[PDB]
Amino acid sequence: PEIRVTPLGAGQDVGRSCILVSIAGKNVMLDCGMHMGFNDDRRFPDFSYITQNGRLTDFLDCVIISHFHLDHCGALPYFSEMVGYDGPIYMTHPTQAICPILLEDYRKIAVDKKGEANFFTSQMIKDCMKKVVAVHLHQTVQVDDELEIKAYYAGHVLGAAMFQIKVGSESVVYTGDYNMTPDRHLGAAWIDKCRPNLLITESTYATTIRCRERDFLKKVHETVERGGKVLIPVFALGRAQELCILLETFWERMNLKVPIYFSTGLTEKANHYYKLFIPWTEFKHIKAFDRAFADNPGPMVVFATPGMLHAGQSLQIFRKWAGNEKNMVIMPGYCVQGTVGHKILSGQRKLEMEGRQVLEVKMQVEYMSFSAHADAKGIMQLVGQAEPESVLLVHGEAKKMEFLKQKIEQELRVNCYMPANGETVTLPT
Amino acid sequence: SPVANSSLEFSQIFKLKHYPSIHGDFSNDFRQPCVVFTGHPSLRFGDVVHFMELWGKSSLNTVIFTEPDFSYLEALAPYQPLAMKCIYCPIDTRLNFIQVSKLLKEVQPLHVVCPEQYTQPPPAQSHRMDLMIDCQPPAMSYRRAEVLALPFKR
Amino acid sequence: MDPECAQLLPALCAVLVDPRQPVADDTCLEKLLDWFKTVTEGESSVVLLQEHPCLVELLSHVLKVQDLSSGVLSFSLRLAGTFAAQENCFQYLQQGELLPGLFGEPGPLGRATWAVPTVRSGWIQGLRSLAQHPSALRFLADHGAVDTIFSLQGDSSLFVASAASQLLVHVLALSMRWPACAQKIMDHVEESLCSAATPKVTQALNVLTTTFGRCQSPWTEALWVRLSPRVACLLERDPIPAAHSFVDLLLCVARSPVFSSGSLWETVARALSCLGPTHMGPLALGILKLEHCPQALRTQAFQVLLQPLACVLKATVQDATTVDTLLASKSSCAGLLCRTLAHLEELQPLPQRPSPWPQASLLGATVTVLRLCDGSAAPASSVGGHLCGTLAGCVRVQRAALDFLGTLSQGTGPQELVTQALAVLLECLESPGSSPTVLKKAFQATLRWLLSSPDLGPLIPQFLRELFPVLQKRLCHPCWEVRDSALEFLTQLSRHWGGQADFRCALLASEVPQLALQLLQDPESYVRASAVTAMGQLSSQGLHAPRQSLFLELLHILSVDSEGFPRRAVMQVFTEWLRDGHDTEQFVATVLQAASRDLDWEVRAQGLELALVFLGQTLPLTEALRALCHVGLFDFAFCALFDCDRPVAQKSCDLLLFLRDKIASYQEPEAVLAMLRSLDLEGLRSTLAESSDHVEKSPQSLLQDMLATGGFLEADCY
Lengths: 429, 154, 718
Ligand SMILES: [Zn+2]
Ligand SMILES: [Zn+2]
What we know:
This is part of a larger assembly, with chains A (429 residues), B (154 residues) and C (718 residues).
Chain A: E1 3-7, E2 19-22, E3 27-30, H1 56-59, E4 60-64, H2 76-79, E5 89-90, H3 93-112, H4 122-129, E6 141-143, E7 147-150, E8 162-166, E9 171-175, E10 199-202, H5 211-224, E11 229-231, H6 241-252, E12 260-262, H7 273-277, E13 286-287, E14 300-303, H8 313-320, E15 328-330, H9 340-343, E16 364-366, H10 376-386, E17 391-394, H11 398-411, E18 416-417, E19 425-427
Parallel strand pairs in A: 3-4, 4-5, 9-10, 10-17, 11-14, 11-15, 12-13, 12-14, 15-16, 17-18
Antiparallel strand pairs in A: 1-2, 1-19, 2-3, 6-7, 7-8, 8-9
Helix pairs in contact in A: 3-4
Chain B: H1 4-12, H2 48-54, E1 62-65, H3 72-76, E2 85-88, H4 97-107, E3 113-115, H5 116-119, E4 140-142
Parallel strand pairs in B: 1-2, 3-4
Chain C: H1 3-6, H2 9-17, H3 26-40, H4 47-51, H5 55-61, H6 72-83, H7 87-93, H8 98-102, H9 105-109, H10 117-130, H11 134-144, H12 146-152, H13 158-175, H14 180-193, H15 198-214, H16 218-232, H17 243-254, H18 263-274, H19 280-289, H20 295-312, H21 321-326, H22 330-346, H23 360-374, H24 382-391, H25 396-407, H26 415-429, H27 436-450, H28 460-471, H29 480-496, H30 501-509, H31 513-519, H32 525-539, H33 548-559, H34 565-580, H35 584-595, H36 602-618, H37 621-630, H38 633-639, H39 646-665, H40 669-677, H41 682-689, H42 699-707
The structure holds zinc ion (ZN) (2 copies).
Binding site for Zn(2+) 2 (chain A): 71-72, 177, 395
Main location (chain A): nucleus
EC number (chain A): 3.1.27.-
């Protein structure tokens, strides 16, 4: 009659993520996640601590995918075909349209870092997504005649959700990345007062209480009025359109003339990602981009897409433009170590390119995280708006959670577990 | 249908080109192939009779019943011998029997009254015994034009 | 090691032992310890300590600063573990009792850092990494380590329990190479197996089933003859204590000719007669896997395996333990039948299969189960009625049933069985209310069945006529999973049945291709991809719906489109055509000059593959090279050699090696051999076969990236 939980990933870290939940009769895997920055089997979670039974499909019942960021849905094609699992996978609707692209893109980094030893091939992408059974928001869906889930709306990325798992008398709500301060990007997370037995949340930005759009625009405008170039790495999707729409609206209100470019290649969702942008909540200045005019004189803004400064476009275009004083680069996202996007953001400007050659740097470097998260204000407000019986912390760090639990159990007087990477945590009802 | 406009208005205020009647305006928008939802679904009056006499000879066309009310075999019968396909895929959003068992165990009614078509399994599928409404105490049933006494005493 | 990184060691050691600089990062420590593992264990580990008296500084400060952050001391502990590998290094690090210091109470063993599982896991990994010589085992014995490990292998983090069990088995397997440590391990295992705490006894069983199977020295059986009473008598409690682990222990002890030499098979039989119908299944399966077994026990096993199907077929129209669970609920019954079908199919392809392997009864039971689950069977008893009323409209049962019923292809027999099985698969395809996770397995199984029937036969055309009006409906299902599976099945046929004019009569008479030809405008990309590959594997036969009117569609999908998958699949289809032999110059030109400027990488790779195929097929050297230059292969080659993406460069340098050797075997020939021989290949071959992160994973680069902490970096979604 208990409810077991175990953060097989996301345990006091922002890397892996895999929350294995066991409700009274069934098992459910939540947010089957990945971890970049590695190059062997140690990137995917350790599923071997589930297979100490018959194979999976007898054990689990449904896997859930909160959003499309690579740290929650970047392991399905290894978990659905290699370890073996033929059971329904419940995503949201936009994530089933995005996650194939982000996966098929991450694979490019993988097979290029020569780490395809135990990996998922392109065929497995399709042969995994064919096991998806999408759900629609606020519209519960039933499996096993006793396991009913229900969606929500939390934002931070087009397609995210906060899922709710029910077996009748008891239930567990799980929240991925949510945002409570209603920034004009997607909206504020709205959950109904279901009063559930367990609520899990993320703690990315905990120990901190709009200026981003301001200073980003100011810096771009300054470096573009001097004949100087910009660089802004971004995935094939995700944080690219929340930048394109910003540049567009700021520009037609300022009537500039500088060529803007966003070259994905993997998809032209510069005019399609907007399609799915509507049912939840097409360009003028933006052209296509290729290798030809990444060198011509004139102010420029370039959006490349290997990821956090891996091999591909960004690394090359950057390696060209390092020897210039007026250009600048911004990294609107976290960076994983072992990547030049981690050398640059923290100090180092004396790099060493292919071979023993030496590259200098004279540009500017900026870190204006355009991510969407919540913090103590919004987290307290949401756990109040939910009235749980326990709150769990994942996708964060050690000391922020350790300080947060004090206030959480202090103000609202509610128990809050802080499980490490793999400890069982049981909560009885 | 002669009630198209008010129908769509009352669906909205609470591609599909509706028309008041096959005679008049409609005969100037007829582009084949097409799709034509029509009047009463017992294939015995309205407009559907006219098409079912128009397309009842070409093995290409198709009728697709979406109403469980009228048994479809006899319904289609008096246009035989017909050479058009006739699919039967009924859409019933009503409570099915496992759901009504769960609903009864939830609401816990002290009794139940259901027509005779329920407390015994359906006739066509006599071998099943799970589509009978299972409830305790046994569900008192009624037959056509009967006078039951719900056994409560004040 | 290496000087270029050696000069960085002191500063990074200082920033490690100093906490005023911000905290370190996990992956940094991990890759750095990996570099240590690969630099030390590959050579002497004492001379590196002698030349660099700086690591010893870290390993001495770790037990003195008393305020190490959560993670730095873990790296230090794993480092002290990987250093103390050789006895000489053990003694060198023993200068000052450093090893008994940090792996003892002076270290983190007692201090209030016993909270983060990472430090404990590092401690255990280090201990296992050092215990490779009898001196270290004597250390563990006299100093005392197993005493604390016993307590440790009970905590709440499986990442520590598993490692603890592995550490026990390693120190054991090194001990007897009865010593005090080995005898204490044995006594602890025994006195734990006779206990009544489920986690403790589970640990005992798993340490036992690793010890056995991972080692087979004479003491293994000399110890199993001792345990066999204690293990066997565990089957006295009404609930079996650790079911799965017990099954695994039996399955590992049994698969050895040593332990088989009397109580083994007898206690396995007692188990088979005792274990409930949730864990007896896999045990009996593992038994039947074994080549050697007293055949009566194999009869018992295979019969208690076949119990569910030969039980169901006494509840339809052609012991009670299993039929009890068959009537318990919808979860338990579906689970039991799915496990039984999974097992019973896992057994078929084996040569140690029983004799005679039943085929009539198996297939009959399987088709009965599938049809019953569809919802049109005919019960003949109360159990048949309730079963038809519980299994109706399921998936797991139906899915695994399709998997079995398709596994039955290696089973030889008359066409009667083939038609029996098709007569239910055809029904399962056109069954309204069939999820997209069912039609796929259904199509796979229908294919395996249709491709194993001993021109064609007397029933193939009849079944095809009855089937294509189902391949014409499920090809427009409103959920792209079906719209893809149907096309894939059509492709499997178009590859296996392209030279059978009767099958072609069936297909052309149907209206399948006039729908595939239209699907290439479906919105969802994967649909377009599978549609293009289907129409490709089709038009290599001459089955076009009422070739250029598809080539134009293909090249149009290739020039502009909103996705990747269609382009990288149409390139595959073009490769198929150009390899088979289904103007050729202009064709290769209009595909290459419009595949080059495409931005994706897979497309350019497949383009290089197309070019390789064409070159090999066309290779008189003068005019051959003139033709090969007309398409502009050299342009694409010397254009995307120094390419952004590396796999492109790998394919290109391979192609250029091919071209170079092939012209060596035999613009102008002198001009082209010059402009090819001017650049380098072998050095380029090396720098491209290298990794993309060869620099940013090197030890020196990692040291730079580590000791330079203190900039903007926090962590966030990728
Ligand atoms: Zn995210
Ligand atoms: Zn996240």
